[PDB]
Structure formats: C-alpha cells, structure tokens
Design a protein around this ligand. Structure first.
Ligand SMILES: [Ca+2]
Ligand SMILES: [Ca+2]
Ligand SMILES: [Ca+2]
Ligand SMILES: [Ca+2]
Ligand SMILES: [Ca+2]
Ligand SMILES: [Ca+2]
Ligand SMILES: [Ca+2]
Ligand SMILES: [Ca+2]
Lengths: 144, 352, 352, 352, 352, 144, 144, 144
C-alpha cells in the first residue's frame, strides 16, 4: 500500500541518517553501537549477502523496498518453522518437554533472560502440562 | 505415562529386532495367504483353500480391525492428532482412508456371504491394497514423487521425444507395409493399428511376431526405429538408478545433527522476538540497554536477525560445498585486514 | 501499452496456472482428436467420425490460423522482430515455417475436398507436426542437440564399434549357417541378408525366430554376439540418463542472477569505451585527469579492460570449482605479503 | 623358516606371473573338464568320455584332496590359525566346509561306484561348487553383499514398487482377458495364472506369445504395464554399474599407506595406556613429571587421548573431502589470531 | 620444405573442413560400395553388380596401394620413422600390417581371377578390415582398452557372478524339466544343452520359445533367473556409459597447456644435469660458485632436483583436487609463521 | 599486415620504456600511476593470468604479438555481447528501459560521468523512445 | 550404576575446580600445565570437536555423563584395533616382528621410554619368539 | 651390491654431519647455503613430501637406502621423458626446432648458462640440422 511505501521511506531515511541514498555496513554498525549492539564483520557480511539483492554491497532505496516486500506468513515459512521444531524433537513421537526448551533458550542464542524464559513457559503451555501444543504455537507465530 | 508412545512405536514405526521380526512375520504370512489364494483357483487346492478362505478372511479382518482401532487410539500421542479434530486429521490421511475402506468392504462382503468370484477378487484387491500399509516413512511413493519432481522437465522432454519417434516410425511402417502379407496368406499389417502394435512390441522388444514386415524397406525402417526409440524405452531405469547413486554419494556429506541446533534455536528466538514486536508494553525492550520512536528500529533489527537466522537455516540443510570455504576465507581475510589496519594505525600514532 | 507483451506471454510462453491449464487443455483435446481419428478407420467409428472429420478439421484449421496470425502480429514486441524485416525473420524460423506449411496444406486439402485416404493421412501428419509447436524453449530438440554435441566423439566411437561388431557377427553367422534348414524343411538363412536380419533382431532382442541357427557353432557365435554387441544397443539410454543426472547435480551450484550483473555492466562499459576509442574528438579523455601520443596507450588500456571483463564474463557463466578458491587464496596471500613487507620496511625505517 | 608362508602365498593368494599362470591353467583345465562332461551326454562323446570320466574324477579328487591338506597344514602361518583350535577355525570357514564336503562326496561316490546319472550330476555340482574356491579375497560375494548393504532401502523400495506394479498389471490383464481366445480356438488366458505368466514374460521381454491378449483394451493395458514396470526389471544392472563407476572414481582419492601409520601407532599406544591405567603399581606414572588422587585424572587424560586417536583413525580411513580443508583453515586461523593477540599484548606492554 | 608434413597431415590426420570432407566422402563411398556388394547377391543386382565388381575392385586396390605408398613415404617426417629402420618400424605397426595384407590379398585374388564366392567374401572381409584404417588416434580400440584396464577387477567380478548364476540356473531348469514336453508332443528340453540354450536366450531376452518350460516350478525358477542374471547381461552398457560421463565431467578441470611447460623444461634440465654428473671434466660445476669430494654431493642435489621435477610432472598431468589447496595453504601458513617469527625475534632484539 | 606489426612494435617499445624486451607488472603499474590510474595487484594478476600466454609472468614481444592477433568482431564476440544484454533484461520480453541502464552506469563500474551517460542516452535511442534497439547497437559495436 | 554416576560427579567437580558447572579449554590447559603437559590449541580443538556433543564449546555435566557412557570393549573397538595392527603389517602374511614395533614406539608417538618398551616386549611375547600373538593381545586389550 | 650399500652409508654420513642418524631440513639447508644454494622452505617441503617415505619428517638411514634403491632407466622413465618432449612439441608432427629449445632453456628453469646452451646445441644435433633426433636423445638419457 502507499502508506506502507511511505513507512518504508521514512524507515530508510532514519536508518540512513546520511542523505546519500545508500546505507553501508559502516553506518549500520555505527547505529547499532550507538544502541550498544557491539557489531561484528560477520554480522555485516550476513547482512550484505542476503538483503543486498542488487549486489553492489550497499543498501539502496529500491533494494530496501524489495526486501520489505517480504512476508513472514508464507507456506514455506510455517513449513520450515515446523521442521525446525522437528529438528530438536529427539524422541520423534510428537512429545516435546519444556525443560529442554528452557535449557536451550538459557544456554544458546542470546542467552534468554529469565523474564523471556517465563514468557516462553507461560505462552506455550496447555495449562502448564509441560507438553506444548506446538502446532497452535506455529499457527500463532504465523498469524502474528 | 509412555504406554501410548510405546504402542505407537510398536505399531506405526517398528525398529530394532523384536518389532522388526514381528512385522516381517506379518508381511510374510500375508504374502503366503495371498499366494495360497492365487493357487486356490487351480484344481490342486480348489476345494480345501476355498473352504478355508472364510476362516482366514474373518481372522484377518478382525486382526486388521483391531490394529486400526489401536493405531487410531494411539494416534493421540502426536500433538497434531490430539482430540477429536486430531483423530479426524489422522483418519483423513490417504493410508487411513485406504485401511478403513478395506476393512469396511471386507466386513460387508463377509456379512453378505455369511447370510462370488468377483467378491473373492475384490478380497484379494483389498488385501494387496492394505499390503501397501507397510509403507510408513513414504520411502516408496514420496521418494518416487520427489525424484520425478526433481526431473520433471527431463522426463517430459524424453517422453515427448519417445512418443513422437514411435508415432513417425509406426506411420513409416504402415506406409511401407500397407499390403503386408506373411507366409501362407495372412495380412499381418491390416492397418496402422497393426503397425502401431508392431511398433510398441518392437520398442518393448517383446517380439511376438504376429505383425512382422516382409519387405526390405520395412526391415530397414524397423531397424532404424529400434536404434532410435528403444533407448527412450530404456531411459527411466538408468536415469533413476543414477539418481539413487548420486543421492547415496551425497549421503556422506551431511553435518551432524547438533550443528543445526544453534541455528534452529536462533531462528525460533528471532521469530518470537518479531512476533512480540507487536506488543508495546513488553519488558524486554530495556534488556538491550528514553525510547519513543526507536520501536520501528528495534522491529527492523529483529527482522534482519530473523532473515539472518533463515539464511543460517537454509545453510544448515544443505551439504558442504565451495560456498562455505569461500565465505570462511572471506571472513578470515577481512578480519586479518581489519586487525592489520588497526595495528598500522596504532603504530603510526606511536612512532610520531 | 503492454497488450502486445501480455498476448505474447499468453500465446508463446504460458506460465502460472491459467495459461498453463489452457495450453494443457488444448494439447489434450488435440491428442483426443488424434486418437479419435486413429480409431476412425476401425469399423466402430467408421461412419460417424468420418462424417465429423470435416467439421473438426475446419474448426481446428480456423483456430490455428487465427493463433498464427495473432502470434505473428504480437511478434513485434521482440526488438529483433520489429518491422517488416523483423516479421520476416520471425516467419523464417523453422517453427513458423512448419506452422504456415501445415495451415496452407490444411486449407488446400479442405477446399479441394469441399468442391482420399492419403489426404486424411496427410491431415494427421500435419496435425502431429503442428503438435510439435508446444516446444517453445527448445527443451527437447535443442537439449538433445546440445547433449549430442557434448558427446560427439563418444557416440561416434560407440556406433563405430557397434556396427563393426554386428557386421562381423552377421558374417560369422552366415558362414556357419549357409545351409541352415529348420524343422519341417525351410531355409531360414537363405543368405547373409537373412543372417543380417537375424543379427539385428538378436541385438534388438526381438526374437522373432524366423531365422534361428540350427547348429551348435551357430548358437555359440550368436551367444558371443549377444554378449558383445547388445551392450552397444543399450548404450545411449544409460549414457544420456547419466548426462541428465550429472546436469541436474550441477544445477545446484549456480551463482545468483545478481552476481553477473556487475560483470555484464563492466563489459558493456569496456566495449563502448573501446568502440569510442575511434572518436578522437570525444570529451571523455580528460575524465581520467597534455595528450598527443597517449591515445594509443588509452586504447590499449581500454582493450585490456575489455579482456578482463571478458574473463569475468566467462567466470560468471561457469559454476563454482577449485579455480575460484585457488585465485582467492592467491590474491589474499599476495595482499598480506605486500602489507607485511610494507610494515617491515616502515619498522626498519623507524628503528634506525 | 618361511616355507609355510611361501606355500601359503603359492596356494591361497597367487600373484605375479608364475603362480598366476599356474592358477589360470588349473581354472581353464577345470572348465575344459566341465565342458567335456557337458558334451559327454550327447552321442558324439557318449562312450569315450564316460569311460574316461572315472580316471579324471579320481585324478582330480586326489589333486584337490592333497591341495586341501597342504593348505590346511600351511594355515598355521596365520596367528589366528595356530594350533588345533586355529586349524578348526580355518576349517569352520564356509569355503573350507564346502571343500571338505565336496571331497568327501567325491570319494564316497567313487568308492561306491568302484565296487548313476544322478551321481554324475552331483559330481558336476561338486566340481562347479569347488570351482567357487578361486574366490579368495571375497571380491565377488563380499563385494556384492557390501553393495547390497549400502543400498538396502533403495532395493527394498524398488522391488516393492515392481512387485506391486506387476501384480496390479496382471490383475488388469486377467479382468480384460477372462475369455481370451486366440486364433483357431485356444484359450491363451485360461486364468490369472496365465495372466501372471504373460505379465512376467512381458516384464522380462521374453515374448513367448503363448498367452497374448486379443483385445484392444488388453493391448493398451499391456503397453502401459511395459512402460511402467519393465524399468523396474532393468534397474539393478544400471544401479550397481553406477555404484561400481563411483567406487572407481573415489578410488583415486586415498591417502598413502604411510599416512595412517602414525594414527595407528598413536591409537595402539593410547589403548595400552588406558588398559594399564588399571595397574596402580606401574612405573610410567612419573614419566609425565606427590600423586594420590590424580590417578582418576590420568585415566581421564588417557581416555580422551584414546578418543582423539579414534577420531584420527576414522579420519584416516575416509578419503579427502571439504571437512579436512575446513578444519585446516580453522586451525591456521586460530593459530594466527593467537599469535597476533600475543604480539598486540606484548607491543602494548612495550609502548607504555 | 614442409611438403612431407603437409601430405602427412592430409593423409594420416585430416582436420578442418577440406580434408575432413574428403575423408568423409571416401568413407561414404566405401560404405556405398560395401552395401552394393551386399545387395549384389540378391537377384535385383545379381548380374550388373557382379560384372562391375572387377572394375571397382581394381580401381579401389590401385587407390589404396597408392595411398599406402605415399603414406609410407611421408612417414619419414616423424623422427622415430626416419631411415630404413624407421620405415620398417612404421610398417611393423598393426595398422600398416593390416593394410599391406589387405592390398596383397586383393592383388593376388585379382591376378588369379583375371587369368569364386569365397574369394568375393574375402574381398568384402579385406574391404571392411581396411575400413578400420580410419581409426587414427586410437579413439576406439585404445579407448576401450584403457576403459577395460581401469575396471579389470570389476568386469572380472561381474562376469564371474554372471556365468555362475546362469550355470546354476540352467542346471535348475534342466532338473525341473528333464521330461519337458510342449504342446502336440515335442521334447523341448531334450537335455541340459537345451536348458543352457533356453537360459542364454532368456538372459539375452531373445524369447525364441523353442525350449520353454511347461511346469509351474520351471516358470518360477526361470523368473528368478531372469530377475537375478539379466542384470549381469545389461551391466557393461551402463558401466561404460557412466565411465564416459564421468570422463567428460572431468574433462573440464584440466590446466592450460602452458602450465606444464615449466615443469617439462625443469625435468629436462634436471635429467640432463644428472646424466652429465658422470662427466668429471665438465665446466658447469663452477657455475654454482676448491672441489674434490663434493662431486657426490652435487650428484645427490641433482638427483633430488630430478625427483622434485618428477613430482611436478605427475602433478601437472593430474587435474585439480583437494591436495593442491592443502599444499598451497600449508606453504602459505609456513611462510607467514616464518615471517612472524622473524618479526618477533627482531622486535625482541630491538626493545632490549 | 607489416604496418600492423610495426605499430605493435613501437607500442611494445613505448609500453616497455626499459629496453629489456620484457615488460612487467611493476612497469605497467608505474606507467598507470604516472597516468594516475591507482593500480592494484588484483589488476596486475588479472593482466598476467590471461594475456601472458607463455606463462613466464612477463610481457614479451612474441607474446604481445599473439595477444594483438585478437579480433573483437568475432561471432562469439557478438553472441556473448547479446547474451550480456540478455543478462540484465529482467522482463525477458525484449523490452529494455533506459532508466535502468542509466542507474547501472551511474552506480556500477567506473561510475560513468554525466557526459558519457548523455552519450549513452543519445547514441542508443530510436528517437528517444526509451526502448533501445539493442540489436543494431550490437551490430555497430561489432562494426566499430 | 548410581555409584558410577557419583564417581563421574566428583570427577567432573575435580576437573572443573571453578564451580561454574561448565569446564573450558582454559581450565583444561591450566590443569595440564599444572601437571606439566605443555598443552596446545590443537589439543584443545581435538578435545572440543568430539567430546562436546552439545556443541556449545564447553564441558557441561550432562555432556560429561554422555561421554562417560562410552565403552571401550565394543565390537567396533576390537575390529578397528585389529585393522590398526593390520595397518603396519607390511608383509600381510600374519607375521609381525618386535623390532619394527620397538622402532615405531621409540621414534613415534610419545617417544616411549625404555621401561615401557621393555613392558611391550615382555607382555607381547610368546616365550620371546619375536612373533607376537596379536589376536590374544587384542582380546586382553578389550578385556582390560 | 654391498659396495653400493657402503657408498650410500658414507653418503648418508657426509650429508648428515651430525651423527644423530637422522638428517633434517635444517641440516640440508645449512649444507646448501654453505655451498651457496639459497634454499627455500618450498624446496624443503618438496624434499620431505616424497623422499621421506616413512613419514616422520626426517632422513633416516633405512629411508635413504629405500630412496637410493631407485632406478632412472625404468620403462616408465623413458615413457614419461618421451611424453615430456611431446609436451612442448606444439606442431605435433614430430618436428622440433632448436631455437625454441634454446629460448626455453635460457628463459626458464635455472636460466641455463651459454656454456650449457652450447652443450645442448652440440650434443642434440644431427650434423647441426636443427631437427634433433629426440628418440636417440631419450635412449642416451636412459643409457646414462
Ligand atoms: Ca532517501
Ligand atoms: Ca562508523
Ligand atoms: Ca623491443
Ligand atoms: Ca614501479
Ligand atoms: Ca558440578
Ligand atoms: Ca588458564
Ligand atoms: Ca649413520
Ligand atoms: Ca641451520
């Protein structure tokens, strides 16, 4: 929609903060370290290699529109998220325990804070039975 | 506590030696019953087998009915098959529909018979159809479907060439042998229907010989057709054999299951964070640390983290190749360029 | 504004589901008409089909004539097919020539018939020939031609071996069975023509049996011929199946379409600069900045830039391999050698 | 000193040219005797060959008895075949059991005959069974078993599809041709037994023609069956040919035999050290140098060294791949990061 | 100056378009003469072709005699074929021997005939034997020999399995059908000779049907034999097709011809230096610069240089693989370790 | 032609400026930096790997003659240039817009000056319709 | 067994000596250099890559239990040890000499001390014949 | 022969000059630089990777005997030398000119001195015709 295009326009302008019309890894790292995100060249290349579809190594306005034309509710999206829940399902019988989920969240990734760990155990719980109904969890991830 | 899971493993997915031998025994006894029913029509076992057909039929239908009932009851272990809706989803599967159709047809024919040849043949049909139930991981049908899906354009092209070649060859055969008469006066090629039948026999190399050209030009064109189009007839066997060989060759280059665990966890975390970006009153915003217009920036950061996690997930599912080496070398070279530049700047500052 | 492009996409290159199903329906109705015409000669549909042949013939010829006219009109979208010369270039294509020949033959036979068997057979021939029009990307003919071109020497060698083997085997069969008489007195091998026919039947495994050797030495030499030369007969199917399998395997290692965009742009720029090197009065010479004899040097620089761009273009079209890793490692090692040498020189200067 | 090893090499594992030609001569004379016995039944050599059968039989049985005796005596060279228990282990091998059974059956039949057709046929059976003794490295049976073991699920799937396809095709053939009568009044398809025989003939492309459908629908379904299921019939040849081709392709990427010597020595040393960890009074504990509770720590260190040696052994047996390059680059990058960090720390200390 | 080389290129190794079309015309006219001689025996061309056989025979023998003479004269261009000994070496080649035998047999038969069927057949034999002369690069015979040499053990194993399987299957067929009588009273399986013939027909899928089992057990064992051993019959086609496919795949990874020039030059220089090490009075010893016992050391240095050059030569002939990347990374890492160690030592000296 | 050989001779002598008979990456970089072309070892290796056909790593006189024996009007040349125009033809319908060409020229390659951008839009224009007739453009590239 | 689990517990605690619950390459190198084992990052990575089954790069308690659930008497274990004795069996006739074993032990690996070399030649010797009965040696390696 | 073994013995002792019984790249480089051969680690690894058949990275006495058990007159040797002469035979017609041989010797390898270039043109010359009889040259390389 036109309003969505305008929103992407001011988002691009704010993320640029330079007026050149192209946004670089230097500027992205600068804004993250202003926020305090201690960036890395690994993050910079993980950004360049996929979003920058033109291939010039920068972030142009038409490029940004192309990557904002994405959609997270794709059939491929819920299929891959379901397979991801199947990745750590060691038993393979459709039974998933909350203890292993808590351990993985705490010891891997961003090292989830106890607040968001409690958020995990409260949102994904059928009356706190320990066996989360991950299909409806996938549905309400996709529903957003 | 785990009785439902145990019975589900025992029934749906046998493994090890106990359940594996049990399922092998069931399969072999089913095949023995099928071959005995095949031999039943012959006069060697015309009477005894037919007299014993009803007993084995009722025993088998009872066994498969109980098996279907217990499998449906144990289907509740799967999260997607929990409740009445989940049981319906399990039943709506093609295999479950096949099983219920087979058992209902069996009980119908048995109750009608209790109080002919077509009924017995339908019994064999439902037995061999239920025999397909042993396919549990889809290793036959899903595998062949995937192989076809990979090579759709190739099979389309090959079939197109084969049909066009056989059609032109059959037309040439007919025009050469319009008046084809074999020894002792029979018109073997009465029409291009006969020509097409001879062509398909030749391409399949059956060689029945009921329609064989009797002219030298016909023999030459038949030889050319055999040279050209029989290769099309032999294609798919070699094609899918090579496909299986290359799949097995690539089966040796997969990463260990623990390598994709960090990628899966990271993508789950990023997906949840993107979903929770719609919740303004969350308390996780200040963990990164006043904040009024930075919510959109945080949403963009979470979105790009989710995209990076998606890239990591696609990288995890694919085997090793040159791209991984290229990106590893690129990141190492960039790191060492950066470090050398920092050292050069510091040394230039220090020397004065 | 885009109506010509839209109709060109609808006709020439169907895609998605709407046009794809439309073309599938056209193809299946064409095949249904073909099979009904095939069954027409048989007495089951001798009268009704023949009576309805003219109606379907005129309807189809009108449909294909309109389709050809609209496709030719829409061909103007392509730059190479703009104007009368472009329309002629579109018509000079083999597929366009085939279509126009088919439609003109159809209208000729229909107008002659309006006011026999050969005419109907030619109608079937032109229908199956126009049936080849569905090939639009050349995925059948161009693909088979490319596959043959890749393996020209291999097919030449294999065919050479096969023909020589079958020729010697047939000569041995004839010399062994000059007086070959089968049961009840028929000379099956009346000559080495019969021997050659038996040999080609054996290598194609038809097994008609009209000419079968009746001697033990003949049976042994026939067995040796079957062992040796039938593999030649079975070669091409496996050969091109393996070729397709390896092509599909290599289909996973192509760079993204945006990676070759910089190379294409650079080569276009270098080509234009080389062309404009012939224009002395250009104003782009001073952009690099008095200049009298440096025009030749600038021409050489532009030529070497064009050669480098050509190298980049050839690198873009080929998939990943060891060469890319080798050159990346070489450039990185050279860069870090250069940087370390610069650091060593500067430190030696500084220490004094 | 080495006479037992020399005779073991001469008998069990011929190599070079002398023993190789000797074994080839033995094999060819055995085949000549077999083919002469095959020709013996025919009236050309009915009398002379039968009269000379006993002489060659006794000579051969004496030769193979002496060969078995000397091979068993020379089996003591192998460490696992030392002593009476080792001789029994050598005899318990399937090949040794086959040889002893063959020789005992031969001597039994010869002593009974000295003082009919079935006995002679059993003589041929034992001769061709002993003929299998030339397989010494298992290059036939062990190789085929390994190839099957690698592709167990693939052959299971392919056979499953093939049998199901042929079963349904035969049932369709029977239902189409229940009343199949060929020319001059014979019921070719008397039953679905005849239908199954015709189906297996078609899938094997024998084309005997004793049961050929006489209806157009039967011809069409037979053509569909030939298109679908004959590829299954042709699968295994191409499958294992591709397997052999890929094995030979991978035969070029093995490390030299001296490269695995350090890994083998290290793993032997670690295994011995782990075993000797159970010996508290050993004098090797102080070599690493007071020690009361560190025995468990030393056991853990030896265990992890043994695990590392096991990893090295598994790496040695596998050919080169991307993993070796990845780990080499990782270790080099880590080393140079560590060295650069040390240099940075030392320079920061020095500058002050 | 280059007339001998030009005629050698024109005759032995045609290339481009002029000589290529000339040789193609010669080959096609030879094939036309061969097929006309094949058709000569048939009454259509019994008289005219036979009357014209002598003219074409003498013209062709004169042409091939002149061609052989000029080729032998032009063979002097090759260094190994210089002089009478070189001409004899050229003549001792199998192709030259074949050509001289063919021409001498042709002139003998023509002079005897001038002043029967076997002579004409021998004429065809020598024509098709001389037809093999078009093979100049050995692309047929040498290529097949190399392919066999690569897979000797694989073909040995496969043939061994195939013959053993067919032998046991034929014995089972005979024991099942000792009294095999077909319809209307003929003993199809008169013996295991008939059983072997039926088995070879089945494995080659000829399906003549002269010996078909009439028992259910015979049909089952024949089906098992067809399942097992026909794959052996179909092996070599797929095996060598996959071999050709992998060879063509590896044809894309060869280094440019200029890359092996330095290795060849270095190995030639080292070989000459090693040879000249036996010349004490040479003046090249002081180029490296008093020297009494250092001649042995110089010989060892030259020998190790020659070994290194041999290693470079073996590396040049093999395509790219992981070893080149491994050694390049190893040498780069060693260089940068050495440089960093030198820098560390110098800095430690400087800081004091 | 003999005159062409002589022209290549003085071109080789001028590009050498050393008299050794062989020209190296050091000399090529020196002459470019005298012109002001800020060379790079990447350019040096991109030069060595293709022109230096002998493989000695230098630029000899017979080598230079071999690389000057080239020809830019080859059938392969116009085929590859046509495919290159097909590379960035996103639509694939034979329609190419001048706006994307201008953007690519300005943001990629040598960062074309406005003068040569105007040269592009004036030479490749059928009365300024925006749909360039790229087939005749290929022809007059090859015609030179 | 429960006693075995407890033994693994105090072994993990002693090898940690930090109380964090996770043991790192730094701590392992520190304890080895306290023992005097002059560690190397190569040894550290050879440890991480195989024992650390979770993949977090550390040594956790459940991980340590998983790697202590090993067994050295596995059929694969004696098969691989037998193949290893077959690796250096140059003759391939089942004859192995003690001289080559002594040379390999002395010149490769940990450079076996004369004491353990004598241990080798005394334990693996059928009355000092020089032809060790390596099958029973494999058996009593596996028997432990 | 026993005399050959003794010759190899004193050759090994002289090339060692240390008495350790094993000779290393350090000692080989030291003796070459004493001779003045300005060695390189590339030469050192090109030595280790092929002669050192045991794989310990040094030069032991049994190793040296194994590499001195070589023979330069092998059928493979003359076959590979003949193919090497075929490598630079650009014409492929069996004609080889002495001018290209002189150029290659002078500009590649050890940069052959004019003395050994004259040795080349005098030893390999059939009365100075310029077309060397390379088959007899191969024979008298192999004959030594
Ligand atoms: Ca903007
Ligand atoms: Ca910045
Ligand atoms: Ca000059
Ligand atoms: Ca310079
Ligand atoms: Ca603890
Ligand atoms: Ca520490
Ligand atoms: Ca010594
Ligand atoms: Ca030194």
């Amino acid at each position: 929609t036109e309003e969505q295009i305008a929103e992407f326009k001011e988002a691009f302008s704010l993320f640029d903060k330079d007026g050149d019309g192209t946004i670089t890894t230097k500027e992205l790292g600068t804004v993250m370290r202003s926020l305090g995100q201690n960036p890395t060249e690994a993050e910079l290349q993980d950004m360049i290699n996929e979003v920058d579809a033109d291939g010039n190594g920068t972030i142009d306005f038409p490029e940004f529109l192309t990557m904002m034309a994405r959609k997270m509710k794709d059939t491929d999206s819920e299929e891959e998220i379901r397979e991801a829940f199947r990745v750590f399902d060691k038993d393979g019988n459709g039974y998933i325990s909350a203890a292993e989920l808590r351990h993985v969240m705490t010891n891997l990734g961003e090292k989830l804070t106890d607040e968001e760990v409690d958020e995990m155990i409260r949102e994904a719980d059928i009356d706190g039975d320990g066996q989360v109904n991950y299909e409806e969890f996938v549905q309400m991830m996709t529903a957003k | 506590t785990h009785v439902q899971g145990r019975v589900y493993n025992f029934l749906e997915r046998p493994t090890g030696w106990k359940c594996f031998v049990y399922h092998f025994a069931v399969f072999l006894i089913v095949l023995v019953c099928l071959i005995f029913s095949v031999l039943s029509t012959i006069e060697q076992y015309a009477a005894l087998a037919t007299g014993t057909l009803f007993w084995m039929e009722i025993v088998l239908v009872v066994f498969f009915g109980t098996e279907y009932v217990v499998r449906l009851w144990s289907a509740g272990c799967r999260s997607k098959y929990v409740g009445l809706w989940g049981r319906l989803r399990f039943a709506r599967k093609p295999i479950s529909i096949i099983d219920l159709i087979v058992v209902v047809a069996s009980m119908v024919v048995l109750c009608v018979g209790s109080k002919a040849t077509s009924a017995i043949r339908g019994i064999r049909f439902l037995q061999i159809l239920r025999m397909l139930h042993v396919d549990r991981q889809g290793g036959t049908w899903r595998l062949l479907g995937s192989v076809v899906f990979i090579h759709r354009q190739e099979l389309i092209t090959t079939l197109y060439i084969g049909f066009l070649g056989l059609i032109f060859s059959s037309y040439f055969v007919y025009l050469a042998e319009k008046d084809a008469v074999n020894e002792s006066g029979r018109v073997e090629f009465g029409s291009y229907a006969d020509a097409l039948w001879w062509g398909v026999v030749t391409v399949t190399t059956i060689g029945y010989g009921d329609k064989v050209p009797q002219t030298w030009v016909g023999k030459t064109i038949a030889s050319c057709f055999s040279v050209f189009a029989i290769s099309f007839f032999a294609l798919p066997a070699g094609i899918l054999g090579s496909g299986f060989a290359l799949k097995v060759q690539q089966k040796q280059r997969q990463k260990h299951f623990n390598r994709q665990i960090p990628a899966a966890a990271s993508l789950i975390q990023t997906a949840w964070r993107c979903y929770a970006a719609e919740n303004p009153d969350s308390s996780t915003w200040k963990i990164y640390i006043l904040r009024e217009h930075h919510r959109a920036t945080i949403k963009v950061i979470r979105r790009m983290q989710y995209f990076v996690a998606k890239k990591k997930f696609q990288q995890a599912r694919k085997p090793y190749d040159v791209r991984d080496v290229i990106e590893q070398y690129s990141q190492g070279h960039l790191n060492l360029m950066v470090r050398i530049k920092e050292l050069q700047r510091r040394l230039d500052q220090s020397i004065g």
